Prior knowledge:
alpha/beta; 29% helix; binds chloride ion; M-phase inducer phosphatase 2; hydrolase, cell cycle; disulfide bond; hydrolase
Amino acid sequence: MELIGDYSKAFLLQTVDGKHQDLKYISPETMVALLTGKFSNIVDKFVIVDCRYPYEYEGGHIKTAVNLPLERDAESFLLKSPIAPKRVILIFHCEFSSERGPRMCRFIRERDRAVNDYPSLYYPEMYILKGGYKEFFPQHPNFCEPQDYRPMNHEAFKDELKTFRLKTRSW
Ligand SMILES: [Cl-]
């Protein structure tokens, strides 16, 4: 398997097959391994990027995850003042379409390359959580908060979905 983004070393986490062949996916068990500190001797810091819309996040998210659905906010939070360290790892998730997750992952890499001299990067190691929150929650509900799940297409939030869509850079 290839090395991480800045070609400094191997990817640390075991991966699983996902839709995008070129992206790295991890399972809920691996996400819990990180959260429970199984990689504490190697991973100095990791960030869980929940790119679902706010109402989804508010209805139940993984503990410590940061809600960054808009590219500009993700860029600002991650790249305005780079979270340096050991390894730093980012985990993105926003399942159930328009490829939010993969797109955000690719966007951050694009911006990281743009502010660095090749091949250096602030976030050389990034993964996608396989199955997103929908598959994580029924496996480890006590690692979520609140302990619930609110789908993007929840009948009662059809307007919140539209309202938020109108704040994106492109559709
Ligand atoms: Cl956006």
